[PDB]
Structure formats: C-alpha cells, structure tokens
Amino acid sequence: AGILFEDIFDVKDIDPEGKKFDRVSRLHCESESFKMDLILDVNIQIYPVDLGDKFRLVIASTLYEDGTLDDGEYNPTDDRPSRADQFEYVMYGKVYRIEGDETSTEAATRLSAYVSYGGLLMRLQGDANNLHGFEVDSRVYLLMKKLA
Template sequence: MAGVLFEDIFDVKDMDPEGKKFDRGDKFRLVVASTLREDGYPDDGEWNPNDSSSSRADSFEYVMYGRIYKIEGDDGTGDATRLAAYVSFGGLLMRLQGDPNNLHGFEIDKPVYLLMKKLAF
C-alpha cells in the first residue's frame, strides 16, 4: 500500500490491569502511514468532517497523528542491525524498533498516522 511505513498484526499475550482492556488472545492490526489518502499522495494534515472522499482512517477504529522526533541505531560499529524510530503523538510517545529494512521510510520530523483496529478471529 502506498504511504504505509509499517504494518503488522499483534497478538495480546500479557495484559495490563491498569491499561487498555484487551483479552488474552485478542489480535489487532497496527499501521503507521505517512498519509491517510489511499492513493499514497501527501495530505494537508487537516481533518475535515464534511469531506466525503474515502480515507484510510475509515477502515480503522483508532487513529492518531504524530511526528517522528528521533531515529537511532545500534551503538556498534558498521551498519546498524536494529533501528528505533521515536514518534510523539502530542505527548504520547511510541518507540518502534526493528530491522532497518522494515523502517527505511521513517525520517526525522516527518508526520505520521498510527491506525489500529481489533481483528475478529
């Protein structure tokens, strides 16, 4: 999909009694995208409730807008074997760590959308 920087399906294995209410075995889909437009073209970063055009957000239950503020690699010499991208969603922080090939579209100061939905299976 155009504009998608990261996508995965997660299984809930442990639960935080103080946090979001998930049941053990629940699955959810998480997508980090650079735009909400299905065609991958950049959007203007503003939401208009009167806009009738379809959006990537229409297929998700939860959407947040944030900005990448830091990217760091391994402290070892040579090419990094792991990268970590840090995103701030208005103070709610996310660290996404993984293989550099999976995080190649992440750039500092780039706006991103985090989209989530619970899967029924």
C-alpha cells in the first residue's frame, strides 16, 4: 500500500495574503471527517483550481503501491508495473520538518508535517494518529483528483 494519508479536502481560500508568483498559487483547505488543516502550493497554470473545489488527497510513499521500493530516479519508459494513475495531479517531494505543539514533557497531541515538492511547499496539520506515518527526510508522493 504505502498510503500514509487519504482524505477529501475543500478549498477555502486561494492566496489570502495576495498573489506572490504568477504560476503558483497558495491555497488553504479544511478537510471533513478528519478536520485537517492544509496549506498547499500548486502550479495554477497546468492545474487550475477555483474556490469551493473538492478534491481527494492521497499521500503515498510509492506509486506502484505493491510494496516495491522506489529508487527516486526518473524512469519514464517503465510505466508498465501498474502505477497509480487515477489522479490528475501528481507531485514528488521530501518531508523536511515535523512540528509538535507539546513541550515534550508528557506526550504529543497534534503534529504538523512540512513537505517540500521541489520548492512547492506544503504543511498538513492535525492529530498525531493520522500523522504517525510521516518520518523526517523521507520521500513522499502527492496525488490529487478533483471531485465533482
């Protein structure tokens, strides 16, 4: 499997501070059935996103999802072994920061995961139960498909 996280999000704000880059817009989302905060940067030129859009977010360790480990190298000609291509937007990146609200005295209750997709940054907040699978300096695939 390798799916670290899976949910459906709702776009609430697109560039609240203002547009800082032409091809990249920063969007804030609130999930349902998990109550997950999310900040995501997407390439708005290739993938247009409007307010009120619903999409399914899948965070996966590998695209094959058969337990096969990825080498991290671009191999376009080996598209054979049944990769997860049911999603319109697929990104690749590395998680670099894990934040905890606690003071490390008793336990940790909420976690923040910071993933950088080649400079396109993403923060995902929420409970530690759904964020247990994230480990710092691991390599993470992001997959979205817009829902109608």
